[PDB]
Design an enzyme around this catalytic site. Structure first.
Site: not given
Ligand SMILES: CC(=O)c1ccc(Oc2ccc(-c3ccc(-c4ccccc4Cl)n3CC(=O)NC(=N)N)cc2)cc1
Length: 370
Positions: A35, A225
């Site tokens: 991520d 991202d």
């Molecule tokens: C296809 C693709 O590429 C894909 C599909 C699904 C995915 O599943 C998830 C699962 C969990 C999170 C999450 C929950 C809480 C947080 C979070 C929020 C604030 C601070 C730290 C964290 Cl860990 N996060 C991370 C997040 O918000 N990341 C971001 N917006 N890039 C985000 C995405 C990832 C990738």
């Protein structure tokens, strides 16, 4: 050697790309979401219905407790955990072991994803957005400080291409693998070290300029991202973009739920009319003032496999997610505060169009940042 790192990413379409990591002594194998839009190394450390494996601190001889909790609520759920350090390795990465911070997730809701096959998250962004605050050193910062690994990583996300479809790719830590791309690498400045923030200066749909004030493209911010499925666009940009895509694909139309990214649209076995859908070009700020370059994506990128429309509206600015990244080899050059783009060796394309990275284009730009 970078050859050991080729194909070290796996996942299910729309569920996240993960890399294998080990935590603790003896090594505990876990699959970890890559991520670039977050900054915590956080792993499941208690039973959960979607978890088949989790981090067991009591089983590690090298675990050190920080006696500090972390709480992360967000719109829909939360994750909560206890902070500590332990030894961490990437088996198909650099041949090193780092003592890193670890958030041990004890409680959560709507965090883990059923069937995704990952047990944690590797936040590769900068300290400014780490939880609970910026004093918690992110994994990559620890890696660079403790080892001789260069301050740079690259991502080749390959998607599916012809149960949820399997996706694959490569995370090259500490360098650039020339076999993973063709043509030239073009670099856009990292605007500020928090998210991987960038500036979009122009966007066209099938060569047609949207003709918006460029502040609108970065309305709030624009980021790169790997933790987001879709190309996410600010309200005004999204509406402008869908209008143009609808017009280009007017020869036989689709239901409103499709354009809202909610419901699928199907054809059968290689009958998909790709040529009806337009190409999308994002022009990114170049290293030199008045200079930009474009990345061009195909419908094969923004129609996620039956297909879902993988462009959606955002209230938090532009998010260049997997949709964008799957066309390209993306270099996160932290040492030189820039992000590189080149045509990927693996991207999905037909015999009439290809993904493209082209420049320079002159754009007269400094005030596109919001
Ligand atoms: C296809 C693709 O590429 C894909 C599909 C699904 C995915 O599943 C998830 C699962 C969990 C999170 C999450 C929950 C809480 C947080 C979070 C929020 C604030 C601070 C730290 C964290 Cl860990 N996060 C991370 C997040 O918000 N990341 C971001 N917006 N890039 C985000 C995405 C990832 C990738």
């Amino acid at each position: 050697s970078f050859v050991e790192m080729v194909d070290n990413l796996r996942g299910k379409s729309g569920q996240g790309y993960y890399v294998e990591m080990t935590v603790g002594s003896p090594p505990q194998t876990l699959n970890i979401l890559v991520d670039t839009g977050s900054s915590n190394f956080a792993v499941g450390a208690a039973p959960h219905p979607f978890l088949h494996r989790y981090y067991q601190r009591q089983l590690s001889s090298t675990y050190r407790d920080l006696r500090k909790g972390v709480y992360v609520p967000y719109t829909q759920g939360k994750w909560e955990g206890e902070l500590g350090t332990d030894l961490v390795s990437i088996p198909h990465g650099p041949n090193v072991t780092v003592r890193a911070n670890i958030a041990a997730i004890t409680e959560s809701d709507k965090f883990f994803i059923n069937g995704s096959n990952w047990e944690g998250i590797l936040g590769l962004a900068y300290a400014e957005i780490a939880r609970p605050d910026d004093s918690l050193e992110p994994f990559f910062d620890s890696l660079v400080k403790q080892t001789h690994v260069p301050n740079l990583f690259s991502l080749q996300l390959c998607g599916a291409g012809f149960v949820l479809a399997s996706v694959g790719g490569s995370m090259i830590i500490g360098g650039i693998d020339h076999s993973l791309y063709t043509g030239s690498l073009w670099y856009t400045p990292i605007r500020r070290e928090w998210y991987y923030e960038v500036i979009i200066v122009r966007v066209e749909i099938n060569g047609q300029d949207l003709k918006m004030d460029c502040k609108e493209y970065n309305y709030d911010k624009s980021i790169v991202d790997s933790g987001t499925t879709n190309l996410r666009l600010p309200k005004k940009v999204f509406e402008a973009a869908v209008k143009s895509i609808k017009a280009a694909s007017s020869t036989e139309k689709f239901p409103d739920g499709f354009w809202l990214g909610e419901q699928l649209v199907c054809w059968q076995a290689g009958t998909t009319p790709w040529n009806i859908f337009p190409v999308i070009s994002l022009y990114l700020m170049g290293e030199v003032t008045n200079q930009s370059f474009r990345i061009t994506i195909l419908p094969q990128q923004y129609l996620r496999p039956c297909y879902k429309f993988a462009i959606s509206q955002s209230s938090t600015g532009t998010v260049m997610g997997a949709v964008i990244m799957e066309g390209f080899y993306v270099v996160f050059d932290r040492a030189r505060k820039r992000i590189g783009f080149a045509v990927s060796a693996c991207h999905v394309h037909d015999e009439f169009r290809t993904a493209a990275v082209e420049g320079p284009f002159v754009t007269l730009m400094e005030d596109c940042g919001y």
